């Protein structure tokens, strides 16, 4: 029944995209589909098995100027990128080249998910990247530098029910842009809404994973400089 909902909302996205129609129903449909796939690999398989990926490429292409539409689409894809079993699905050139471009989007609400997709796909290692090896390395440093250009969002862009997705990213020491995205993302949601996340970031093991970054011999100065900024609010949250 929830897969029916996903299929039906996907149907609305298909409909609105065929008619190239940016409107509150499409924007709400993406948001809905973004939520239904959160922390839901099962609802992510359906998005994928129901051609969501190719449909969302169509949305990204159809509405290259629609930053809200891009954010919600990428939001969903950020959720697919959290599922390892769905890695080879996003290993699609035309998709990554587009994501890779939205990585440099000025909209921070857009590039954040672009980066988070990228970060999750890079985080899977050298082997899992079935796309151009040169591009993955171009992304590796483009992902890093894109984050450094980012502004503080005006408000909370994304909501998280857990930080566990970010935890395996904290250990990508060979790929600091991946770690940079993770720590920036926690730095964002925590600082934006510390009454939500700060307790939970501790309660899931964030302290140690963040301490294994600050007090880590070889760590990118920026990745550490964010883990410092997070731990200051975390340690302030403890006392």
């Amino acid at each position: 029944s929830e897969l029916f909902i996903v299929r039906q909302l996907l149907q609305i996205v298909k409909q609105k995209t065929n008619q190239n129609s940016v409107d509150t129903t499409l924007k709400f449909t993406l948001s809905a589909l973004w939520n239904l796939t959160d922390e839901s690999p099962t609802t992510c398989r359906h998005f994928i098995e129901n051609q969501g990926l190719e449909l969302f490429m169509r949305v990204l292409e159809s509405f290259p100027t629609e930053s809200s539409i891009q954010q919600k689409v990428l939001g969903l894809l950020n959720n697919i990128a959290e599922v390892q079993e769905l890695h080879s699905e996003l290993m699609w050139k035309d998709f990554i080249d587009h994501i890779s471009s939205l990585l440099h989007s000025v909209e921070v609400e857009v590039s954040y998910f672009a980066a988070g997709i990228i970060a999750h796909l890079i985080s899977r290692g050298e082997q899992a990247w079935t796309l151009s090896r040169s591009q993955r390395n171009s992304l590796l440093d483009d992902l890093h530098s894109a984050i450094l250009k980012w502004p503080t969002p005006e408000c909370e862009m994304v909501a998280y029910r857990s930080f566990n997705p970010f935890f395996p990213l904290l250990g990508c020491f060979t790929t600091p842009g991946v770690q940079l995205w993770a720590v920036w993302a926690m730095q964002h949601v925590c600082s934006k809404n510390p009454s939500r996340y700060c307790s939970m970031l501790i309660e899931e093991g964030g302290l140690q994973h963040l301490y294994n970054i600050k007090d880590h011999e070889h760590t990118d100065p920026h990745v550490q400089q964010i883990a410092v900024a997070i731990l200051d609010s975390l340690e302030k949250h403890i006392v």
Binding site: F28, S31, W34, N35, D38, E39, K72, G75, N78, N79, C155, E156, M157, V158, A159, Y160, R161, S162, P165
Partner: peptide, 7 residues
């Protein structure tokens, strides 16, 4: 993960 916007 989740969208901040409700409904």
């Amino acid at each position: 993960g989740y969208i901040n916007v409700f409904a």
